[PDB]
Design a protein around this ligand. Structure first.
Ligand SMILES: *[C@@H]1O[C@H](CO)[C@@H](O)[C@H](O)[C@H]1NC(C)=O
Ligand SMILES: *[C@@H]1O[C@H](CO)[C@@H](O)[C@H](O)[C@H]1NC(C)=O
Ligand SMILES: *[C@@H]1O[C@H](CO)[C@@H](O)[C@H](O)[C@H]1NC(C)=O
Ligand SMILES: *[C@@H]1O[C@H](CO)[C@@H](O)[C@H](O)[C@H]1NC(C)=O
Ligand SMILES: *[C@@H]1O[C@H](CO)[C@@H](O)[C@H](O)[C@H]1NC(C)=O
Lengths: 616, 49, 340
């Protein structure tokens, strides 16, 4: 069939010349299809063979009988087009990938587009060429460092370059100016506050086959029971995921309270200020003179913007049998077997755990600072960066003022739209989208007469309805398997994030680990932890310089007697024809001492000679 | 006035009373295809295939 | 009694080629008579189209995280390496440096990275240079054009290789010139001496064997550069990733030639031999088989993205705690005695 020489004279046509370079439909001696022909000289055709097949059974070449010529067939183009669309624009910007504009305007599209230009990715329509202009962030990323920006005015779209990160430039020399190096040292500093959110838990979802595949019909159950235990594995995997989430939450709760020792004379509602630092926004109830629920102002502010919280699902499921408003998308999912269960621990006792962990770093015996008071602890932490102790002991009110200002700024930043609330809303939005996509599978026909068990039941006999029910059963089982696979893929990332959060709590909040570039951005001082909808919120405090001053330094000197000295976290400056020592983060000159530098019994030729340093 | 007809698919919007207020032909332009895919008359900003 | 400095190389995978699959052009046909039947299955393509989008979003997020970890806390001088001497105290570092001056644009790959990028063909720019040749006429036996016509494409990442190479080489020049942001303000030889003193070697031996340390560093760099002529363990994984990706793509493409219980593997033969009243029965089998294949593929992708993210997090941690700082954790950044 469709290959031979016995033709039919029913619908006759006229022979035409084989055109090359155009996507045409052919009827070559029986074989049909579409493609582009190309003439090529071949010498591998015998008298009994005239067509060329591929390794999979596809025509790739052939030879004509009337002209004795060889041709090669290639498939035609078939692809999609990218469309970048803004919020309230009138026409999206088009992008054809790997296709020049000289090919889409005369072979694919026939609309008079007054804006078109080639790029590294292909042809762009309804945009301008502005590659010479950079941009920090974008919402429509195309690829290869290119972005499309929408500017309200030609074409409102601009094709620009995407550069997310830069480097700080300082106008200084690189060469040795007389054996010295010119470096910038800060003079005035402050304390800055950053915030981050780490997800720990995930909504627990339970599905039942006794209501999803077969709602209440008996003829459906009679066919569902024939597959066997195909539905028990789903429940087993769901229970395993729930147990993993419970174990994770218990591990987090154990990591919160581990070795904390507090005084029994603290339940006074007045011990909330130390070293003129206000911590009322971080502490809640600690004692017995409170009710059942107790949180902090920051946690309350975070929870007031998230409706689908732990108590939100309960309050939504409670309003399903009353009669006030049953048109929500939550009760319809519960009536089909998809139900969200609350976790073991509530959002109140975790708040108490966080409050106790925060108090442990404020009052004796200071179980969170190894027995060191908060001001002395922060002073040692800021001294570890390479500053002098005199400027720290002389300026103590400024530190508390900076802490209070940073805390107030972090508290006020929640009124805007930050990344923490963005992720907290994105996780629940993704969960809701997944639930809706799983629920929508009940209205698909799956190649049947109707997407409803009642319409299939009361329209035909069981012998003709068994196949129609089996199709829907297979479709719904495939959908459930896909959902289970997605849940098993997500639980791994959830557990990894939770483990990272536990490690950060253990090594950044309760203890001060010497791991640099782990808890902050190199200048990390301390961190505090709070609860947040489905995760934890970390507030880090960092040392931020404000002013700078250039200075010439020398990385070590050479004393008299073939002995050398080297600085320890600092530099050597030359002030008033004398060599003094300065810190690596401050500019308080101090004389050289024994506990300030390190000695060596030999000095190299690169060190500067100074035989007048008699500070042995 | 006269215009031909054909079997086409449209996206219709119903108000609270039940009167059709907005209609989108899902085979006119690319914006119409985006609105048909998102099933909304004000889709979000992004790159669609 | 006598010592030396040795070098070692390790490769850590961070990214992965973003694969995009078209539904209507792959599962049913390129024709129009199949879509009328495919529309009966409801919104089945939405999940397949969203899984790949989520995977690509996760890849972009982790790439941005790696870029942020590489480009954090870096302060360089304005008079950068504009044809300046790339050696510090007789230590030639030109092999692992590109160019970051006002001139020398559109090219930021170091001579060391060129040896790695020349041994592979399916790189970031490889797919771009191989996809734009299908229109003008590529090789007759080219499979990428067929995969693109069937709906399987590879999208480039949001950041090019040149930009990543520039961000990487901007961190090497950090701890070579003032200010030393990657060494907490300590010069390179002084930092090496401080890091090697922690093992037990006294300063009297270090201050007299600086030329020995420089020669050891130069010899180690030369050996690491020359080791790319053979097949080491670093290039093995780079080749294996591409081979596995190509094998997966070929196995996914081969599903179109199966029968799945029908009478033919091509709809052109079915539509040219039977009527519509006896065509859906044959098309349903192919539709179900190809949908099952796509589901298996997206499940495998969701299973692999987890290990990809784990490796990326490991790489981020190693970058944050090994090169840009000195962590007092033994047996983490190397095999015991770690100097740099
Ligand atoms: C594109 O159109 C031009 C002119 O209409 C024609 O010469 C050329 O062969 C066409 N190319 C294809 C691939 O159809
Ligand atoms: C094609 O080749 C065959 C084989 O010899 C020959 O018989 C025939 O005449 C040729 N036709 C033309 C048009 O040259
Ligand atoms: C990089 O520079 C651009 C242009 O000045 C700016 O918009 C962006 O915020 C900068 N990014 C960083 C991380 O400094
Ligand atoms: C640092 O800045 C603060 C606020 O601008 C100021 O009160 C203080 O006197 C400054 N200190 C020095 C040493 O300049
Ligand atoms: C110093 O002592 C006073 C007196 O009680 C107290 O108010 C203040 O908080 C103390 N400051 C520090 C840093 O300990």
């Amino acid at each position: 069939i469709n290959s031979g020489t016995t033709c039919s004279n029913d619908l006759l046509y006229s022979n035409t010349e084989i055109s090359t370079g155009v996507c045409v439909n052919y009827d070559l001696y029986g074989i049909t299809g579409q493609g582009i022909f190309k003439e090529v000289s071949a010498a591998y055709y015998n008298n009994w063979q005239n067509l060329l097949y591929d390794s999979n059974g596809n025509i790739i070449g052939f030879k004509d009988f009337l002209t004795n010529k060889t041709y090669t067939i290639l498939p035609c183009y078939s692809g999609r087009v990218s469309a970048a669309f803004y919020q309230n624009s009138s026409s999206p910007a088009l992008l054809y990938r790997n296709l020049k504009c000289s090919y889409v305007l005369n072979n694919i599209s026939f609309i008079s587009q007054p804006f078109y230009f080639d790029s590294y990715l292909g042809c762009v329509l309804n945009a301008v060429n502005l590659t010479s202009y950079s941009v920090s962030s974008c919402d429509l990323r195309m690829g290869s460092g290119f972005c499309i920006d929408y500017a309200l005015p030609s074409s409102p779209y601009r094709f620009v370059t995407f550069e997310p990160f830069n480097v700080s430039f300082v106008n200084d020399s690189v060469e040795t100016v007389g054996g010295l190096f010119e470096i910038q040292i800060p003079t005035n500093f402050t304390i800055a506050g950053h915030e981050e959110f780490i997800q720990t838990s995930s909504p627990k979802v339970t599905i039942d086959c006794s209501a999803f595949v077969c709602s209440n019909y008996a003829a459906c159950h009679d066919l569902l029971s024939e597959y066997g235990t195909f539905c028990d594995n789903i429940n087993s995997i769901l229970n395993e995921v729930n147990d993993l989430l419970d174990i994770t939450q218990l591990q987090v709760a154990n990591a919160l309270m581990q070795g904390v020792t507090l005084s029994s004379n603290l339940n006074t509602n007045l011990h909330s200020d130390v070293d003129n630092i206000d911590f009322k926004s971080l502490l809640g109830c600690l004692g017995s003179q409170c009710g059942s629920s107790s949180r902090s102002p920051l946690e309350d502010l975070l929870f007031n913007k998230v409706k689908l919280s732990d108590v939100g699902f309960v309050e939504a499921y409670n309003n399903c049998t009353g009669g006030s408003e049953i048109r929500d998308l939550l009760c319809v999912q519960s009536f089909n077997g998809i139900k969200v269960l609350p976790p073991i621990l509530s959002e109140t006792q975790i708040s108490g755990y966080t409050t106790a962990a925060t108090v442990a770093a404020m009052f004796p015996p200071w179980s969170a600072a190894a027995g060191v008071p908060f001001p002395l602890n922060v002073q040692y932490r800021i001294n570890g960066l390479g500053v002098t102790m005199d400027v720290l002991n002389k300026n103590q009110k400024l530190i508390a003022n900076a802490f209070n200002k940073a805390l107030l700024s972090i508290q006020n930043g929640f009124t805007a739209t930050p990344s923490a609330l963005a992720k907290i809303q994105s996780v629940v939005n993704a969960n809701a989208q997944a639930l809706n996509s799983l629920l929508q599978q009940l209205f698909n026909k799956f190649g049947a007469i109707s997407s409803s068990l009642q319409e299939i039941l009361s329209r035909l006999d069981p012998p003709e309805a068994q196949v129609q029910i089996d199709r829907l059963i297979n479709g719904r089982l495939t959908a459930l398997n896909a959902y289970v696979s997605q849940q098993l893929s997500d639980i791994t990332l959830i557990k990894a994030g939770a483990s990272r959060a536990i490690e950060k709590v253990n090594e950044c909040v309760k203890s001060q680990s010497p791991r640099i570039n782990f808890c902050g951005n190199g200048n990390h001082i301390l961190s505090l932890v709070q609860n947040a909808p489905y995760g934890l919120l970390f507030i880090h405090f960092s040392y931020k310089p404000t002013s700078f001053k250039t200075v010439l330094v020398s990385p070590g000197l050479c004393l008299s007697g073939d002995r050398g000295i080297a600085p320890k976290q600092g530099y050597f400056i030359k002030q008033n024809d004398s060599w003094m020592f300065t810190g690596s983060s401050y500019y308080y000159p101090e004389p050289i001492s024994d506990k300030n530098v390190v000695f060596m019994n030999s000095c190299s030729v690169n060190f500067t000679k100074a035989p007048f340093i008699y500070l042995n | 006035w006269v215009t031909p007809l054909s079997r086409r698919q449209y996206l219709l919007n119903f108000d609270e009373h039940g009167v059709i207020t907005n209609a989108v032909d899902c085979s006119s332009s690319f914006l119409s295809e985006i609105q048909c895919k998102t099933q909304s008359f004000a889709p979000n900003t992004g790159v669609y295939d």
